[PDB]
Design a binder for this molecule. Structure first.
Ligand SMILES: Nc1ncnc2c1ncn2[C@@H]1O[C@H](COP(=O)(O)OP(=O)(O)OP(O)(O)=S)[C@@H](O)[C@H]1O
Ligand SMILES: [Mg+2]
Length: 163
DNA sequence: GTCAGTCAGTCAGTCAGTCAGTCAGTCAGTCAGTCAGTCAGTCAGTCAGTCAGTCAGTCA
């Protein structure tokens, strides 16, 4: 039809979804809307992993394209941290130092709100055995079997990546 | 005892068979003379910790 449509993805309800495609074509649109939809339902905060640190200095305008989705309530960023009507929205950090984070309490998670997990022809960015790095990330955002649902999202379809 | 001979040994003659030098393709051998990926240094650039400069939340 018109845009990226996560309805079937949300429907078939894997505890861990895995979608690919639509480079910039809303593959991030609906999935950045969804955490704020959980916030309007008043659920839990989300976790935003980043590939590296400079990628963080410019990305504070993460809610610009979801206002036209939900003009109603307040969706802003105070700085590094995201605030919806002033309540904490996203725990936003690149990869380098998640270990120092992993002793902190992380009681509230809603959904995986990152994409371009893996870039085509890009392994200089990569970290050795980062598949187990995502394992540490998930177990340090797990408290039970609930509150979490994950997605992968690569720009294109390949059959060579280790995952 | 002459005329001089007319059917076997005899020697003038081969006559196809014979040995083995002598070049000879040729033989893969081979070993060595040519040549094609292999790595080390150095060139440009990616990480994630510094400096250390600065608009600004709690106060004079
Ligand atoms: N529900 C929607 N309403 C309007 N536009 C949408 C919708 N879903 C997707 N889009 C389109 O998606 C675009 C932005 O999507 P993105 O968030 O960039 O997706 P993306 O594929 O992650 O690209 P990047 O690399 O993350 S910026 C918009 O400009 C629209 O063209
Ligand atoms: Mg995206």
């Amino acid at each position: 039809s018109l845009f990226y449509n996560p309805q079937k993805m949300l429907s078939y309800d894997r505890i861990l979804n895995f979608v690919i495609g639509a480079r910039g074509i809303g593959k991030s649109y609906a999935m950045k809307v969804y955490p704020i939809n959980r916030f309007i339902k008043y659920g839990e905060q989300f976790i935003y992993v980043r590939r590296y640190k400079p990628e963080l200095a410019k990305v504070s305008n993460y809610f610009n394209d979801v206002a036209q989705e939900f003009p109603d309530h307040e969706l802003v960023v105070k700085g590094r941290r995201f605030y919806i009507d002033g309540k904490l929205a996203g725990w936003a950090i690149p990869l380098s130092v998640w270990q120092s984070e992993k002793s902190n309490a992380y009681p509230n998670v809603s959904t995986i709100v990152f994409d371009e997990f893996i870039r085509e022809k890009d392994n200089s960015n990569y970290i050795p055995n980062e598949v187990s790095a995502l394992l540490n990330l998930m177990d340090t955002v797990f408290r039970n079997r609930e509150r979490v649902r994950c997605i992968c999202l690569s720009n294109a379809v390949s059959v060579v990546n280790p995952y």
